[PDB]
Design an enzyme around this catalytic site. Structure first.
Site, short mmCIF file in Angstrom:
data_model
loop_
_atom_site.label_atom_id
_atom_site.label_comp_id
_atom_site.label_asym_id
_atom_site.label_seq_id
_atom_site.Cartn_x
_atom_site.Cartn_y
_atom_site.Cartn_z
N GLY A 8 -76.77 1.63 -13.87
CA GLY A 8 -77.17 1.76 -15.12
C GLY A 8 -78.75 1.92 -15.32
CB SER A 23 -77.68 2.37 -9.00
OG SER A 23 -78.76 2.65 -9.79
CG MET A 24 -80.54 -0.73 -11.93
SD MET A 24 -82.15 -1.14 -10.96
CE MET A 24 -82.51 -2.77 -11.42
CG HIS A 37 -79.13 5.78 -5.96
ND1 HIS A 37 -78.29 6.87 -6.35
CD2 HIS A 37 -79.41 5.01 -6.52
CE1 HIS A 37 -77.80 6.35 -7.60
NE2 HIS A 37 -78.53 5.12 -7.71
CG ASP A 78 -75.98 8.86 -3.97
OD1 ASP A 78 -77.00 8.58 -4.45
OD2 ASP A 78 -75.19 9.86 -4.21
#
Ligand SMILES: [Mg+2]
Lengths: 189, 142, 190, 190, 188, 190, 190, 182
Positions: free
Chosen positions: F66, F95-96, F120, F169
């Protein structure tokens, strides 16, 4: 909105923060004035008059204005009840919000040091056959007459000066609002 | 039933006495209804039908308001008399009016100030120094 | 909508502000009169009659109008119950709002000094075949007949005058409403 | 929102996470500053002033920005109440968010080691006649001048430096925000 | 919806639950499946609570699903208590049907309620055979409604057929003359 | 969300499954990271750090990632508080999400045997004048630098290897995540 | 949904109307059978079975149909549990509604005097490649075969007659539903 | 619906160690299921847990999160297909403890390859396709382990939508036995 719980001998009271403020006779006007908001405010004023008929009530204002009819409902309730109503501008008093700001008890109308107030003529609209355009225009003009007259009676300013100054959107600082007579002093920290 | 009331018997055997009712707010509210006759007339009827006269006693009722309780009583808004007034008003919400009306005086104890704490430490130390001194232990505290 | 806590001998109870006002027999009409609002108002009036059959009831009106059917539901309930219903206009009484304002008990209809009331003929609509439009028009006309008749019976103003004056939107001040007989007196501040 | 049952003495009560944190005088601002967010924050500040007039308050900031009026309502309430407010920037303070971060008590304004802050001139808009666009432009300019004055006082930077620095979006690291004077130290971990 | 406190219990109710305690059932909305389901559950509960005291059904609805209306009707017919019906404002479509479904002598309207009766609405889409089937079903539903109304007003089935062809608004007096209600209840 | 009931020496308490997990210091991060979710997570971490300053905290991660700012707010809160924070990937950490998975205490980072983790470069956006696109690009690039730096410090992988391997990715199995140094061991089932 | 005050030998318990009916062991099926409705019905059946293995259960049906899978879930649960499940058509049982109506215990299936029941072949849809359309058509046809078979085995009607009378939307009165063997008898009023 | 003893029905069933999986396995559903499984493990380390399955499908990630929780916890997890198990629904049905996997007599199960999608540059489509293929590899492998069916047979049978009855599901080894009524 967080909940405050007060623990006593008899039991547990759970207040939303606005209900906790209402316990101290603080009323929060923090949204656009519509009929729902005005009905809430009127019922709170009547309740606080019942709860104690001789202690001041504090009305905190932070509203962009709203419906004129609902603001007159609040105004007439403030004028009816025996307790003096102190009005404090927290952040903005626009349109009817500034009208209700000027409606506080004499000597008990306040603004925070850099909260802003704004005054303007009432908005409205009409869509019509020519008779109905005429009717709506006459009603809106009488409403402006009412607002100008009340403001002249409570600020002490002349009715011509209000008619002129409220023509376009007029923004005022706390000091300008004080010398305009909408508020009685600026709350020094 | 062949034993008396404990309070009535103790007062009957010692009619000149101080009676302490301690943390009255913790009791059930209706237990105080017994004292109504004691405070208006100084007479409590034992279940045997024996009248015990309280007319020469002193009756003291202590009540606690916790730190949270008396914090919650403060006014929230922009800008000792108010403490006493609000504390007494809150007391009126806990007891019948016909009970408080019997009471000769309702007194509010103020939260101890810093120099009062200093005097309390002075007094407790003085008492300790005297008790040790009679043991020939001389002591002084800076 | 804030919460009131009230301490009492019997104990301590929470109320929403409207239920606390209802305990004092104050009913709030604060919204466009639709079926569920009028149903709620009817139920509150009936409960207030059950609770005590002789103390007055106060109906506080701040409504833009609404369905005529729901307005007649409220009117007929106000007429059926034994207590006097006091009606106080707060902000605006419009359409069925001002109808229910005039429905209050004689001598107990009030407005705040600068409330406004508005009266007009009922709105409606018709769609479809000519016979359907005829039927809907006849029904709307009979509804206007009922409204004019009731208002002429309660204001004491002639039915032709109310027919004329409700033709377009007609805004009235509190004093104009009192002289028109819709309210008995303007409230005076104390 | 997870519910916490932790309570003293009785141990019977339960609180959502935010009310439980409000008991520890922790105020949590994790959203855009709109009017009702600010009004809540103000009421919480007044409550915490009532609860104890001298214990510090902790204000955790993560707002992306918001209404200037609401930010000034919070700023004036922070300035008016007696307690010191510690301001702690967690992820980003931007627009009025970084103004509220500067608003904290002198010597108790903090950022975590890699929070961002951003400062920029206030956004706005105007529509309509030339006169009305003039009036709105004047109002927005005076609001910018007010913000730059308050920032010049609290940061101690010159008003012309803030004027130049706020022209575009100016992202600052925690260390740059300390060097600028928006915050007093970076909360290096244990 | 306001909350009510009744002192003798010192018990809290919401206004509709307070009315239900007095065996008052409120039908204030369009009749759909979940509304009728709730009305059925209330009627069954009131029959269990006491089998012999009357039940009051207050009606202010524009109509609704005919099938839910027959569910309510058949429930009012099954239980032993007399179900009173009082039209508060409007009883249209199945609303006026359920109004007529009350116990004889216990059907009332307020002095200027208005009740309305008409042939039911429906719809058919698709192939000629499916349209035929939907038409036949809607016609048999109209036959049921007409028959029940004839049996509960005493009016001839042909007069109902004639008068329900278009929308027909009846005042409470006209509704009494039609026999949908037994009297127009009178204020003190 | 189902309700748990549990009997305790003081009495009997009912809980919702997340509040029962929070009683055992279990924080669930099961949704897209945004300012409201970060607000919730930080509030829980602060409450747990006040509740007991020594017992471990367990963060169960199942998020597609997010907002970067909210992720850094959670990261900095995890580093600032004194209790150790264990992190367990329950299924996906993208991600995060995977960044917050790397944030757990040394040796206390886990993944279920066939959970996946993805890394990523952060997404962003720029609009308006050339100068504003320049400033946005600079900000996003420094955000990438910051993420790469933190990842290199916490995984022991070189900054150049992270810079290359996060370009597109990059999907890792739990065993590959352990090999990369994101987690320290896979949760062997028993 | 109104609240009910009950156990008037004490008057303590307030129930909600469906929970009061479930205390009687009356399960209400009053809506389109989707999936969470079916799940709730299954959970209610299994609770009533655990609460008492011997007393009959009543299922009240008023539904326009729904997902076939969910109806089979209800059917299989009704077959599995020990108690007899009485099925009563209150208003309408269409599609899977009438299926579950017939699925009751033989001799304990009822309809109200002028309730209506409707039977038709299952609806479905198929989109995509020819092979996917073939697979979907075959699955739908086997589902119709299941429904036809179970209906024949529980009404006693021959399978080729059900195969013919379900060709179109077939509306049956309560009497015709008794003659079709779906219900056992029409509930006669006192 | 409130059950009085008072409880919402699912919490009353949860007190019997019944867990209900009656919806799309999105992500918050799986998180709630994992939390229920953990709470039931802590409530008693050894009594069985009953997972009732009626899900049309869901996210593969959430399915694996449930699967890995079922494999991690100490109790045996029974699974019952109550109406349909499809996509990850049938995968989690097969994931039950051996000998305790059930279906109701005319529940249905469906198995098929996972759906996905990709957009944009050739390289990013390649990356997403490779990921989706490796995920199908994982699903096939786990099904071959827990059904004992050869991985190539699963690779063929899951190519299209493959509807199976309860009997066919038993013959396939997705379930151990069909629940006979009593
Ligand atoms: Mg006396």
């Amino acid at each position: 909105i967080p909940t405050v719980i007060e623990t006593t001998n008899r039991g547990e009271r759970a207040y939303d923060i606005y209900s906790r403020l209402l316990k101290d006779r603080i009323i929060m006007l923090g949204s656009q004035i519509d009929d729902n908001v005005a009905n809430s405010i009127v019922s709170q004023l009547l309740f606080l008059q019942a709860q104690d008929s001789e202690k001041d009530i504090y009305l905190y204002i932070n509203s962009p204005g709203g419906s004129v009819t609902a603001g007159f409902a609040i105004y007439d309730t403030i004028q009816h009840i025996k307790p003096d109503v102190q009005t404090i501008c927290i952040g903005m008093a626009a349109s009817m919000g500034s009208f209700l700001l000027a409606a506080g008890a004499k000597g008990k109308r306040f603004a925070l040091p850099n909260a802003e107030v704004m005054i303007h003529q009432p908005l409205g609209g009409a869509q019509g056959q020519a008779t109905e355009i005429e009717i709506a225009a006459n009603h809106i003009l009488k409403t402006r007459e009412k607002l100008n007259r009340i403001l002249s009676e409570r600020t002490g300013q002349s009715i011509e000066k209000i008619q002129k100054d409220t023509d376009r959107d007029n923004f005022l600082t706390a000091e300008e609002a004080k010398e305009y007579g909408l508020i009685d002093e600026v709350m020094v920290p | 039933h062949d034993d008396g009331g404990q309070l009535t018997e103790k007062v009957r055997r010692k009619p000149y006495s101080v009676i302490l009712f301690d943390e009255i707010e913790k009791a059930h509210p209706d237990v105080f209804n017994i004292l109504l006759q004691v405070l208006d007339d100084g007479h409590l009827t034992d279940t045997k039908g024996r009248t015990v006269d309280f007319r020469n006693t002193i009756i003291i009722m202590t009540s606690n308001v916790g730190a949270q309780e008396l914090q919650d009583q403060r006014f929230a808004g922009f800008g000792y008399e108010t403490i006493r007034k609000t504390m007494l008003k809150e007391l009126k919400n806990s007891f019948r009016p016909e009970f408080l009306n019997r009471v000769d005086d309702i007194i509010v104890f103020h939260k101890l100030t810093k120099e009062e704490l200093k005097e309390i430490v002075t007094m407790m130390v003085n008492k300790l120094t005297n008790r040790l001194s009679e043991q020939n232990i001389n002591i002084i505290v800076t």
